Amino acid sequence: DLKSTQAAIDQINGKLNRVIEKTNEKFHQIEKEFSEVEGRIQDLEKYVEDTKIDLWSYNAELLVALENQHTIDLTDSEMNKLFEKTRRQ
Amino acid sequence: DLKSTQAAIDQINGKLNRVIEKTNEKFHQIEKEFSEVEGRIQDLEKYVEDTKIDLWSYNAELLVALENQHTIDLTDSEMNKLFEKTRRQ
Amino acid sequence: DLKSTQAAIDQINGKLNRVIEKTNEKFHQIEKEFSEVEGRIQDLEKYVEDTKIDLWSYNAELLVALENQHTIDLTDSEMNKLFEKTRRQ
Numbered sequence A, B, C: 001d002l003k004s005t006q007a008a009i010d011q012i013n014g015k016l017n018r019v020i021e022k023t024n025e026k027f028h029q030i031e032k033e034f035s036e037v038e039g040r041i042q043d044l045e046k047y048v049e050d051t052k053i054d055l056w057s058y059n060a061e062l063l064v065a066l067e068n069q070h071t072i073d074l075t076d077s078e079m080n081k082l083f084e085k086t087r088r089q
Helices: A002-088 B002-088 C002-088
Strands: none
Touching: A002 B002, A002 C002, B002 C002
C-alpha cells in the first residue's frame, strides 16, 4: 500500500540529504586544498624572488669587488713604478 | 491523500534538479580553478627557466670576460717588459 | 494511479544513483588532479633547490678560484722580483 511508498520517500530523503552534506564537506575538502596549494605557490614565488634577488645582489657585489681590486692594483703598481723611478734618481 | 504525496514528488524533483545544477556549476568553478592554477604553475616554470638561463648566461659572460682580461693583462705586461728591455739596449 | 507514482520513484532512484556515482568519479578526477599538481610543485621545488644549490656551489668555486689566482700571482710576482734583484748582484 501507500505505507511502503512513504517509507521509500523517507529513505530517498535520507539518502538525498546524505549525498548533499557529503558533497558539501568534500567541496570543503577541495577548497581548503585550493587554499593550501595557492599558499604553497605563493611561498614558492617568494622563495624564487628572494633567490633571484640575493643572487643578483651577490653578482653585483662580486662585480664591484673585481672592479675595486683592478683599480687598486693598477694604481699601486703605477705608484711603486714611480717610486722605483725616483729611487733611481 | 495521494495529492500531498504528489506534491512531495514535485518538490523532491525540484530540490534534486537544484542540487544537480548547483553541483555542476560548482564543478565548473573547480575546473576553471584547476585551469588557472595550472597556467599559474606553467608561467612560474617559464619564469624559473628564464631566470636560470639568464643567470647562467651572465655567469658565462663574466667568466669569459675575466679570462679575456687576464689574457690581455698578461700579454701587454710581457709586451711592455720587452719594450723596456729593448729600450735599455 | 499509484503505478505512475511508483515509476516516478524508480526513475528518481535511478537519477539519484546516477548523480551519486557521477559526483564520486568526478571527485576522483579532482583528487587525482590534486595529487598530480602537488607532485608538480614538489618536483618544481626540488628543481629550484637544485638550481640554487649548484649556482651557489659555482659561485663558491669561482670565488676560491679568484682567490687562488690572486695569491699565486702575488707570490710569483714577488718571487721573480727577488730573482731579478739577486741577478743584479
